[PDB]
Amino acid sequence: MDNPNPGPDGEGEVELEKDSNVVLTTQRDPSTSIPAPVSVKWSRWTSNDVVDDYATITSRWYQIAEFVWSKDDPFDKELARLILPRALLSSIEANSDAICDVPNTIPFKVHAYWRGDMEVRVQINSNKFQVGQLQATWYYSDHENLNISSKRSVYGFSQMDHALISASASNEAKLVIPFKHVYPFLPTRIVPDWTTGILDMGALNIRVIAPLRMSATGPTTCNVVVFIKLNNSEFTGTSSGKFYASQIRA
């Protein structure tokens, strides 16, 4: 079946992802990447306090990153290497804004410990005349590894669970990332231990496998949007906001 019928509305389907007071669309189905099974709820294990999450409020879609994709970028050059708990907060905090100001962060302010699966969209608007390729990959503990520069390479992450994005026919990388840390919970700020590496479950990272191969005088620049949903969460550990921690640098 192939009859093209673009009316006053150029025809084509648009799948949407609402899902909680925010609707974000994608005109092209994503290339998913599921690195692990869905995480069970270990609140009834580690902590016996206010055991809950926040539905309509922390299970939304906030923006955490956005960047540029150009012909200048050589073969393996990561556009982002963003930590995943974590840079949800660390993006907003360095936006000359506070964590307290946004609805998808506020319990991190009050509550001490967090556990939950993650959802991520790597949406880009590239043109059909751009011949490039990216790869969004996940690593459940990047900073803990010593020589991960060895792994920090397009070759290395192809070896593992990832998603693929090609400039033409742009395209989205779905990226379901459930919770798998060593300890079942994460600490939102400084704690009797975890005096650093606060709220870090691993980093995402997008490098390049094919530069934007542009014709003579073709459009140079491109762009990426990183979105994140925090579903299936649990926030036990009620603590005043003066105990909080404005996350570390990029």
Add this chain to the structure above:
Amino acid sequence: MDNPNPGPDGEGEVELEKDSNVVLTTQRDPSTSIPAPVSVKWSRWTSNDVVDDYATITSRWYQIAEFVWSKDDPFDKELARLILPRALLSSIEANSDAICDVPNTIPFKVHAYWRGDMEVRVQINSNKFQVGQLQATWYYSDHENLNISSKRSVYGFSQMDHALISASASNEAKLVIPFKHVYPFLPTRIVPDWTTGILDMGALNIRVIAPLRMSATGPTTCNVVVFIKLNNSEFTGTSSGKFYASQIRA
């Protein structure tokens, strides 16, 4: 039945009110004061957005006030005249602390409009040798009335729904205060209207009907604790925290 049996534990019952991650007790049943019927949920009327409240977090018991009760206080002298939405926030904000810091306020920071019944405890620790009396009274719209100084009197509030507290056999005033404003919702900060009188559903006020009548050299001072539960709520209206409003003065 009257056999006194105070063992190593001086005997006597202690009723408790947990209720959500905080337990507060009262060794003497309260004198309740219900001014109105329970409020229905008008979220499915005024606003079609994220329709929810916050259970274990805003349905707790935070302290908003505390003060002194002495022989010097003449007949009708209000110890507090505290606004009720409102001073839950206005107490903490003037404590050189932020609203964002405490779990029982954080949705007020993000969310624009609020509706909900209120619960209040006026607990005091007075001694059995103190012969005084207070009265905690509620008024669903105090600031809206022009000559309410006329009403601002121990005589006037006895005319209406209130609770009674006597120094001896101290004693608690339960004070269930459901939502009854003119408009079914309250605005958490400045809004296209309500440019002032932000988040005000009425004020509570405790005056004196009987001073602490103390014997020669008897204990002079006393004290009151005001607690507040915000149950049966609803917080529709998601807004960034830079739109927020640090409440007005005492």
Add this chain to the structure above:
Amino acid sequence: DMTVSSIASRYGLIRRVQWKKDHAKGSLLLQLDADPFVEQRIEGTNPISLYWFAPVGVVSSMFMQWRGSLEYRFDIIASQFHTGRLIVGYVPGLTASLQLQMDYMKLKSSSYVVFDLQESNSFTFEVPYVSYRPWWVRKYGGNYLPSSTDAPSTLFMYVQVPLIPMEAVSDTIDINVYVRGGSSFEVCVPVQPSLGLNWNTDFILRNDEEYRAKTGYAPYYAGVWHSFNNSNSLVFRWGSASDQIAQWPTISVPRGELAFLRIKDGKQAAVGTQPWRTMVVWPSGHGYNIGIPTYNAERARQLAQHLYGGGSLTDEKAKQLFVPANQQGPGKVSNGNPVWEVMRAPL
């Protein structure tokens, strides 16, 4: 009935707080640690100080991890004519510096409880267990200094409402505090005990690395020095003349630790108003290390918490731990250069 549970169910005393009417509306009574390894120092006398521990203290002194829920019985000895209100809140995530900067208001932010007392003296608060870790490793790891991780959190007992006592019952009142494993204090894995005997409280000092003043600086009494807080505090001197300050050997301490001194025999210590059995050693800037006598071991530790915490000597925080010069007393010299032993603790 020889169960780890059987033991962690008896209620052993651990603290005694004196509550008074003078206690302000905003005031704390104890800020003791919410973990089985909660101590109670007993006075005297030998170097290593003895400690009191609940049955839920002796175990898991044998185990590595515990993960349990605990509870505290606050026995409040009070008449029916005493009324007040106490708070108690388990706030997880209490680091070092953040243990202060803590009011009774921000405690009301975490799981907390308020108690009314007229004709009902005591009450029992069950301590919640909030961690990122399933089980919880030893706070005291013996015998190994850096192999010991702090407690997951702590509870406080503020005065929500000051006490109002009628003229025929006293205004100060004792608050005895007991501690036992709660409904589910668990215990994980047997390892080296962190607690010792009480039978023979000796330690043959190896080898023979006994800490004592450099050869020639003996005897030595507590005195003052114009170069040490402008003669406002006590420091060990080996003479009464110009700049005769006791020079002490340098103590090589690995990072993450602190050091101070407790003498072996109190019958050989320098004398002022009391035997200066405890001291701290730090460089003097005038090209050596000086022996600074302290009141007790706690005040010697707290000084090491501030000098090894990257501090100076001319800070007010340290100079309030220095012993005043009116404590110099008759100024008895020591019994030669008696043995001190170097204590160690993480910071």
